[PDB]
Amino acid sequence: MRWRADFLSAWAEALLRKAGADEPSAKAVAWALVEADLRGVGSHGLLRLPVYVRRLEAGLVNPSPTLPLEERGPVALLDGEHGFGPRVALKAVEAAQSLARRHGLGAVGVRRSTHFGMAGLYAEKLAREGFVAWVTTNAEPDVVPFGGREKALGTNPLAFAAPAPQGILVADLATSESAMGKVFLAREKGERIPPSWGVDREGSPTDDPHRVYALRPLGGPKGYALALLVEVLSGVLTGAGVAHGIGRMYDEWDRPQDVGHFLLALDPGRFVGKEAFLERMGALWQALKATPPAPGHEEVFLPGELEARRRERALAEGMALPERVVAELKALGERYGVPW
Amino acid sequence: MRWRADFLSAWAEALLRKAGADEPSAKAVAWALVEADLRGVGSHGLLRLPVYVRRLEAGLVNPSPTLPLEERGPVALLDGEHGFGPRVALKAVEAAQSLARRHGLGAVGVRRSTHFGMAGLYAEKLAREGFVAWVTTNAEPDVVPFGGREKALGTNPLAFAAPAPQGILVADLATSESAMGKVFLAREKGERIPPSWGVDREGSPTDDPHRVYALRPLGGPKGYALALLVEVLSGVLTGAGVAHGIGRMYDEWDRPQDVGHFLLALDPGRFVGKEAFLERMGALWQALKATPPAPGHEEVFLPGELEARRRERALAEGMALPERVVAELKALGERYGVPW
């Protein structure tokens, strides 16, 4: 069976408000999770709602942050006050847009935030507003540094978006080879995993998901370097938590997380020009789409293109959700008196 | 035998001036190439001097660009006028520093440049000046887009640096799995290469360097997405050449290259604070260095750390250079009357 995004979004918002979150926060979270599911990124979709609500219940998420903002020129610092990541991040997007419109560039350093879901959503929103956007967030350590055997950095994703005539280019990638969610999945299906995904407690690559102690960086040294880029911009520079100081959303419940985010919006109008940029992006997009395919492929796609086609189809015919996820959501709704 | 950096640098500058380059350009190129060799990045060191000079001889490189600069707020656009990449890039570094010091952020969009060598050198220079830095450059297409069988993008590297008490963090990476230089090397040694490096003319991975038609992106879709990030910032946004419009330094001699670069400097002082940033970077650096090593490793290193230790050793005991490279340099010096 398939579900309607409008129904799921309204339901999620209603549930969150019943749980104590203010309207802006409830709307922001419903948006982030449902929009991720629409694009096929379920790892950051509604399956996260249950834990998000548990964190709120435990008093680890601010239900109504005022979101203090301080700006000077093209720079702004945002205090998330431990509010829901999507709520904090959308305010940062608003600030980045305003700053870039006035200064050509707009950088927002966010601290004291929490898990904000799919980084690409924020980058895409800024791009649809006409900006070239860069969005990063750090996360609790799950990845060993290159050459190490103990966790040092989170999956720390980097997202980058830019508008084109044919669509919105959206690069959104974790800096680790894989993700714990995929490892746990393999554990259930009793399948082997590529040794490139993780290492055992000794620090040696393993093809057994049951033996994975930590994730490995994408392409060895490079993914490790990229994870540090994300950590520096997201946590060190912002005043937020850094690595082990961030807080594990699933494992540590003694204090709120202190996730950091970094957002940068650039106005093409102050560079090559708004319309010129659009045309140039169009030429590049066209050239890529015209590229003859490699074996096993029918055509080349731009990052974010398949995600957009998936969202379009999901809006047109409904969204597919794992039976397990639906069960959890239904149970969550029932205990709060918000019928699914 | 080993060579002295001071001798090589002075010699390179002298040769370039004899070839017609003005003093600033000669000094800039000598610096870029020798500093790359010192750090162990020979692929962008003196072995490049011969072709750089040939491009100059052919009138494809401006020997004395005036480097027109236009600024508005935290944004600057630089016209390299086809000058040597290192000369153009160092001017961009100067502009980025000035802008960031006054606005908190400084972005420079460079167009009509040429090959500028090691991207990390420019990022490192900005970091040693106290800034968090981002430096990118596009390059003539050598890499197929994910899912494609024809070249669409250059090795398009991304560099990122930030100061720490223990040293300068310098992330510097091509977005391709490997590089043509390594493929050609394998071709000579008649060795097999990892199929992850390149594809044949049909677009299928190959372990035979003799059959490599194009390079593959780092980690499939991710490296492709990163290469596009670099292309958008370096070429599309700046007004420089884009992909096939850049110009192949080794293969096309009908017109100067139009390489683009993007530089961003951020003042920690406008975010968490200069001294606070330094301390936080120090804590992160310390944590990484203290990470127990994985098998085959004795300790964990920060990106740029091994490069710094190599440069220190090279300054202390001299630089090692391939006999083939030395032969080429000697021949170059002889035809110009600048004895090696």
Ligand SMILES: NC(=O)c1ccc[n+]([C@@H]2O[C@H](COP(=O)([O-])OP(=O)(O)OC[C@H]3O[C@@H](n4cnc5c(N)ncnc54)[C@H](O)[C@@H]3O)[C@@H](O)[C@H]2O)c1
């Ligand atoms: N909030 C957090 O703490 C956190 C932490 C880690 C990851 N994440 C999110 O989890 C998600 C993880 O994504 P991922 O790293 O697995 O990325 P991925 O491997 O699925 O893809 C990376 C990039 O490749 C592009 N791509 C994939 N297949 C393609 C194809 N066939 N043709 C062209 N382009 C293609 C995508 O559009 C994307 O931009 C992201 O949305 C990330 O933001 C969030």
Ligand SMILES: NC(=O)c1ccc[n+]([C@@H]2O[C@H](COP(=O)([O-])OP(=O)(O)OC[C@H]3O[C@@H](n4cnc5c(N)ncnc54)[C@H](O)[C@@H]3O)[C@@H](O)[C@H]2O)c1
């Ligand atoms: N001018 C151009 O057009 C152009 C094009 C492509 C590449 N390049 C340059 O060529 C060079 C290519 O570099 P690369 O992609 O092969 O990078 P690489 O694989 O050698 O390393 C990538 C990153 O990994 C880090 N690293 C490597 N080994 C490590 C270890 N043991 N511990 C910790 N960190 C480690 C490095 O410090 C670096 O920041 C770069 O300097 C790049 O700027 C220039």
